[PDB]
Amino acid sequence: AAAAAAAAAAAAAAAAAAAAAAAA
Amino acid sequence: KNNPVLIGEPGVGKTAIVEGLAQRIINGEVPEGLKGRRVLALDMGALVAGAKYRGEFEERLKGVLNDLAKQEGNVILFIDALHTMVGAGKADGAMDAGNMLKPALARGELHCVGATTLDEYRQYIEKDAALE
Amino acid sequence: QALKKYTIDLTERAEQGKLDPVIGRDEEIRRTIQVLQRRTKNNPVLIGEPGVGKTAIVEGLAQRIINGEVPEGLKGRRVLALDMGALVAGAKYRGEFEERLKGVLNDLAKQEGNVILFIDALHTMVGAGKADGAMDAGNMLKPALARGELHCVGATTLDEYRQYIEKDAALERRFQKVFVAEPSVEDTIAILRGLKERYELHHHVQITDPAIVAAATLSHRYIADRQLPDKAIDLIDEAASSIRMQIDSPEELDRLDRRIIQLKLEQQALMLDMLNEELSDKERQYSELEEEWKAEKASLSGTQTIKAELEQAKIAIEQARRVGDLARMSELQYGKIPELEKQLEAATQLEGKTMRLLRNKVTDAEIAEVLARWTGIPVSRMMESEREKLLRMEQELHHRVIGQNEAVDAVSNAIRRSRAGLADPNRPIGSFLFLGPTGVGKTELCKALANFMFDSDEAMVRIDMSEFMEKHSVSRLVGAPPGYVGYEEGGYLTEAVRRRPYSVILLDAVEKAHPDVFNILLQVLDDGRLTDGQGRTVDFRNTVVIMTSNLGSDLIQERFGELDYAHMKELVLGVVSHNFRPEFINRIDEVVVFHPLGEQHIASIAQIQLKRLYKRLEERGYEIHISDEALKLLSENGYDPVYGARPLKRAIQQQIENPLAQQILSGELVPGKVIRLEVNEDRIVAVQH
Amino acid sequence: NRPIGSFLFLGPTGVGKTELCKALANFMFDSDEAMVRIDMSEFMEKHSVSRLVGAPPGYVGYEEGG
Amino acid sequence: KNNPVLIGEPGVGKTAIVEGLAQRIINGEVPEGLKGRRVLALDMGALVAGAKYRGEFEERLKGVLN
Amino acid sequence: NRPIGSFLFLGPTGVGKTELCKALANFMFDSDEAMVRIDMSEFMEKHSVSRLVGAPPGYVGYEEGG
Ligand SMILES: Nc1ncnc2c1ncn2[C@@H]1O[C@H](COP(=O)(O)OP(=O)(O)OP(O)(O)=S)[C@@H](O)[C@H]1O
Ligand SMILES: Nc1ncnc2c1ncn2[C@@H]1O[C@H](COP(=O)(O)OP(=O)(O)OP(O)(O)=S)[C@@H](O)[C@H]1O
Numbered sequence A: 001a002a003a004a005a006a007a008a009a010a011a012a013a014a015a016a017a018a019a020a021a022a023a024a
Numbered sequence B: 001k002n003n004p005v006l007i008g009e010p011g012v013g014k015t016a017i018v019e020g021l022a023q024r025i026i027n028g029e030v031p032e033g034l035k036g037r038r039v040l041a042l043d044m045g046a047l048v049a050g051a052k053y054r055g056e057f058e059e060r061l062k063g064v065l066n067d068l069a070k071q072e073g074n075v076i077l078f079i080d081a082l083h084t085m086v087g088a089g090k091a092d093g094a095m096d097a098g099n100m101l102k103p104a105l106a107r108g109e110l111h112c113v114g115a116t117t118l119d120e121y122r123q124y125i126e127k128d129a130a131l132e
Numbered sequence C: 001q002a003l004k005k006y007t008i009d010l011t012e013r014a015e016q017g018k019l020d021p022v023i024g025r026d027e028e029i030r031r032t033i034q035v036l037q038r039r040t041k042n043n044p045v046l047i048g049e050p051g052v053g054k055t056a057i058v059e060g061l062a063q064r065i066i067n068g069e070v071p072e073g074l075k076g077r078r079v080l081a082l083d084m085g086a087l088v089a090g091a092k093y094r095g096e097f098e099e100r101l102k103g104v105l106n107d108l109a110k111q112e113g114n115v116i117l118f119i120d121a122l123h124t125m126v127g128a129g130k131a132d133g134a135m136d137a138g139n140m141l142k143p144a145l146a147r148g149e150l151h152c153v154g155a156t157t158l159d160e161y162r163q164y165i166e167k168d169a170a171l172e173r174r175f176q177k178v179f180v181a182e183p184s185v186e187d188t189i190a191i192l193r194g195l196k197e198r199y200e201l202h203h204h205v206q207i208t209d210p211a212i213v214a215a216a217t218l219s220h221r222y223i224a225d226r227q228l229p230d231k232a233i234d235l236i237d238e239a240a241s242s243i244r245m246q247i248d249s250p251e252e253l254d255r256l257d258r259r260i261i262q263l264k265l266e267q268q269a270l271m272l273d274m275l276n277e278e279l280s281d282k283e284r285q286y287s288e289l290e291e292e293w294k295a296e297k298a299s300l301s302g303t304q305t306i307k308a309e310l311e312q313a314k315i316a317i318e319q320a321r322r323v324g325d326l327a328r329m330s331e332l333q334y335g336k337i338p339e340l341e342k343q344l345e346a347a348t349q350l351e352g353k354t355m356r357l358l359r360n361k362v363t364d365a366e367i368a369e370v371l372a373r374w375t376g377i378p379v380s381r382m383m384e385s386e387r388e389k390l391l392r393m394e395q396e397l398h399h400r401v402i403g404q405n406e407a408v409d410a411v412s413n414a415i416r417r418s419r420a421g422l423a424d425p426n427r428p429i430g431s432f433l434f435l436g437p438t439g440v441g442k443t444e445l446c447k448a449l450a451n452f453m454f455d456s457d458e459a460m461v462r463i464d465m466s467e468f469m470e471k472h473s474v475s476r477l478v479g480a481p482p483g484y485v486g487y488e489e490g491g492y493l494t495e496a497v498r499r500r501p502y503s504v505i506l507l508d509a510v511e512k513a514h515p516d517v518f519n520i521l522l523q524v525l526d527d528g529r530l531t532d533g534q535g536r537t538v539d540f541r542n543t544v545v546i547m548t549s550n551l552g553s554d555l556i557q558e559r560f561g562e563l564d565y566a567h568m569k570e571l572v573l574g575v576v577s578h579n580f581r582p583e584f585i586n587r588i589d590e591v592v593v594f595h596p597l598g599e600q601h602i603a604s605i606a607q608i609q610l611k612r613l614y615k616r617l618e619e620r621g622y623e624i625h626i627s628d629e630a631l632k633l634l635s636e637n638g639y640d641p642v643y644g645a646r647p648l649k650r651a652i653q654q655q656i657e658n659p660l661a662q663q664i665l666s667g668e669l670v671p672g673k674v675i676r677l678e679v680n681e682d683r684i685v686a687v688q689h
Numbered sequence D, F: 001n002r003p004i005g006s007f008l009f010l011g012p013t014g015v016g017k018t019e020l021c022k023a024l025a026n027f028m029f030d031s032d033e034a035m036v037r038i039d040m041s042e043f044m045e046k047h048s049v050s051r052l053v054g055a056p057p058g059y060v061g062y063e064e065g066g
Numbered sequence E: 001k002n003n004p005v006l007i008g009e010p011g012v013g014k015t016a017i018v019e020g021l022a023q024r025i026i027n028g029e030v031p032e033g034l035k036g037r038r039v040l041a042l043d044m045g046a047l048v049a050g051a052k053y054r055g056e057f058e059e060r061l062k063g064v065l066n
């Protein structure tokens, strides 16, 4: 008789940047 | 708070200063209060690598901590890449290395030696205030 | 019972006294005793900004319980601290976390309010130990949290509280917000008195109490970084350790030991002599120093053992206050306390006689030394080499800066108030605006201050302000606000101060920026705070900021004669009033005027450049002398009112190095001939004789 | 509906405006900085409103708020 | 610090420069400290086969190092 | 301290100034295409200095330099 385990399955997000772009 | 961490621009031999400390211990040139001590290097990667099961990383780490309790203030443990232990076992909804060690250093009970790079210090530690 | 198997009993180790005396807090421990003593939701969680003694407050609760200083309903309780890693650890199989957790909760049911469960770092628990086939460790407790079937005591830092708990506001509102304040100065004073007792129990040494309040004042002033009381406790512990290591070995004994082993090796190499007699004499001196050192160590050891016996008597009378033997109280008091205290003070005054190379106390010099090696702000009290070097201030300016007496004076004054303690703890140490025509020291004094104060030229945070003609250009000195580009690496500046917070900051060429760049400096020169985008503050009350322009250059060339310095300053003040904003220069300590150079200045300058020239040609392998007439030619070459000293520099460069290196890579010049720079008829010859 | 009492101060500086507010803070709360002293020269440009309110969600400025 | 890196704008065949190094090693045009070495290539992506579990990546890398 | 030469040439049109500096490079670097030829007359209004320095952080050209 064999039992189970529990796994990680881990990773991160994906990010953004954002850029002002000045007028004058 | 028994724990220094070495900060510089990287290169300038922080790992070297830890080893030269270790030699002056081995030479018996340090003052007496830490004579006969052990200095051992901690791997992150030796701890992490097998533990693809739940919780096994915490058990590896706690068994090491209880070994360090068993040696009873004789071993000066060393961690290179302190900013690596910040997110070390930082798994999905689990415990990292940090939020196990965060009681285990501000009770004096261990004597870890830190060696980080100042940009990774800003990256990974003065975000994360308790460990700092 | 797994309550044994997965907890810490605080109450035992409090009764065992492994914990710390907790002072103040009676409002806050009161309010915790309140929030435990409810019907639903007995769960306070300590929101505490990091290190203000959150674990200390839970410890102080448990120590009052073992004392029984509480309301009656908490008398006889238990408090068990929870290792989450113990709850996670063995759960290699699926489900085992949940078994351990439910078993501990059912045993908490079976202990029936006796055990007040404790959790530190409660932001760990929200999503702890989880995976896809899990119960995620928040869901398992939340009904018991709502109905108060549990007495969870929480302790987490504010930042983790926001980030990690209130990503589910239900499992926020199950708990109760208990705010810890900032402990003040006097709070820190009291808490340090208690742990002063504790740290002398550890570290075998003696502490002056005005040194403690000095440590509190300095730590509140000079570390922007942790919070109280933890930084002043840090100062106490590190100064005690420095005392301990200065006890553990002596420096003059180390130098004399190197001396005697050198003399021993020399004598053994010799085998008239008299070196044998010198070795015997130095070994006698070292032995005398050693025996004094050992005897005063033994005096310290006896003093510390009887201090420890005093502490054990305090332990016994606290045990008698717990238990309640009656004549034992007055017996132990009147026996143990006053005689051991008076011969403790007799050994203390015997040390205060005898301590010679040899420290036993923690005074303010030790705290200052640990600070000044902990950060680098020079607060520690002077060695007289340092103090006379501060009195060799202006001479060592004139080894770089000829003339220029006004700013020599003012900058000397500023650094004197820097070390003197008379500085404002609200401004940076000196605000400085510099005026003069181009090239009479406005870079040079600042490189000289680096070369004097820090003893290196190019370590001065030189934010050259040429670039800043556009109102973009604040964000390359105070970072970029989040989600934009430069969030994760800050500004150039706030690194370059919060690294090394005693450092001269040049703003070179102030007037050629945008006109209002400089309201950043309104923040600076008022109050020394300057918060970049990423949240963080910067103190400026340990640096020196110097600004350079050339505005009154027409007026300086105009009226350098025929006026006093007062109307000169006034009239160029009117000029800057035409140029700068009246908010700004009101924040300036002194506007000086550089005065234009005369010819003996130029001669001195040319001499210094020849000195560095001879240095450059030294590693080349060549020595050179000059005709003094050739120097007089260069005096005739390198004068003009309109430009100052740079035409001398390029004139020297041409008229010397072009014939010189012309002859050099003519392949001619054997080293060794010290080259007279005697003159040509209008040029200068380099000769081989 | 409203805060307690808002103020704009005027006059040429160094006549005790910022120091008056710090004296209020020394009164009411017993610190200079335990108060929110944000000088506005951090805020000369359009984009740095996110230094005070913060980043909208889904970025890097999502873990330190405002 | 035995590890130098190759650099430029691409389309210059630095891959082939490593190849020609290995060919000279085959031919023995090298100094007497490299005769008999093993020039082996490895992708970082070659060990991103199973990147969910914890340490799996790192166990691959440590097994490589051992 | 100072960089090595610093030269403000004066002369009328076509007297070889550009070709002087190219001959310098073609001596020194065996080409003309090893020189920094920043063509300066693009700059007739001020605020293209960010072409040469870079753009300050929190504007567009922060990842790229000038
Ligand atoms: N004070 C020193 N005395 C002798 N050797 C030194 C000294 N400082 C550095 N080194 C040597 O210089 C090198 C520095 O290596 P590291 O100790 O890795 O430097 P590092 O600062 O740790 O670099 P990082 O930051 O870890 S990537 C080693 O070869 C050291 O032996
Ligand atoms: N009232 C107090 N009595 C005694 N020691 C105190 C007191 N306040 C603070 N301390 C000390 O300050 C430190 C507080 O330790 P902790 O409470 O663990 O820090 P913290 O406030 O919990 O922040 P964290 O969660 O541990 S990062 C310890 O050195 C305590 O001895």
Ligand SMILES: Nc1ncnc2c1ncn2[C@@H]1O[C@H](COP(=O)(O)OP(=O)(O)OP(O)(O)=S)[C@@H](O)[C@H]1O
Pocket (backbone or CB within 6 Å): C400, C401, C402, C403, C404, C437, C438, C439, C440, C441, C442, C443, C444, C508, C509, C548, C550, C605, C645, C646, C649
């Ligand atoms: N008192 C002095 N002693 C020695 N050299 C000096 C002195 N004053 C100026 N110099 C020379 O001045 C040169 C640089 O002039 P700077 O002072 O940099 O010009 P400035 O005064 O800063 O005004 P700017 O910044 O050039 S517009 C250096 O190479 C120094 O050799």
Ligand SMILES: Nc1ncnc2c1ncn2[C@@H]1O[C@H](COP(=O)(O)OP(=O)(O)OP(O)(O)=S)[C@@H](O)[C@H]1O
Pocket (backbone or CB within 6 Å): C526, C583, D012, D013, D014, D015, D016, D017, D018, D019, D020
């Ligand atoms: N009534 C006052 N009591 C005490 N100090 C005062 C008073 N009026 C002015 N000061 C001083 O003048 C300065 C006033 O500081 P601030 O309040 O910052 O100046 P301000 O009036 O706020 O205008 P700015 O914006 O700072 S120029 C400080 O150096 C105070 O010491």
Ligand SMILES: Nc1ncnc2c1ncn2[C@@H]1O[C@H](COP(=O)(O)OP(=O)(O)OP(O)(O)=S)[C@@H](O)[C@H]1O
Pocket (backbone or CB within 6 Å): E009, E010, E011, E012, E013, E014, E015, E016, E017
């Ligand atoms: N000396 C050479 N002899 C023969 N082929 C060469 C030589 N140098 C370059 N090449 C060829 O040039 C091709 C492309 O150059 P690469 O070195 O592959 O480009 P790269 O700059 O290395 O970037 P990648 O990732 O390798 S495409 C190589 O695959 C070779 O086939």
Ligand SMILES: Nc1ncnc2c1ncn2[C@@H]1O[C@H](COP(=O)(O)OP(=O)(O)OP(O)(O)=S)[C@@H](O)[C@H]1O
Pocket (backbone or CB within 6 Å): F011, F012, F013, F014, F015, F016, F017, F018, F019, F020
């Ligand atoms: N002494 C010379 N030797 C070689 N070519 C020369 C000489 N004098 C002029 N030239 C030529 O003159 C031209 C100069 O080109 P450029 O230097 O670009 O013009 P320019 O010198 O920039 O003049 P301006 O003032 O910018 S229009 C080239 O075609 C050169 O070949």
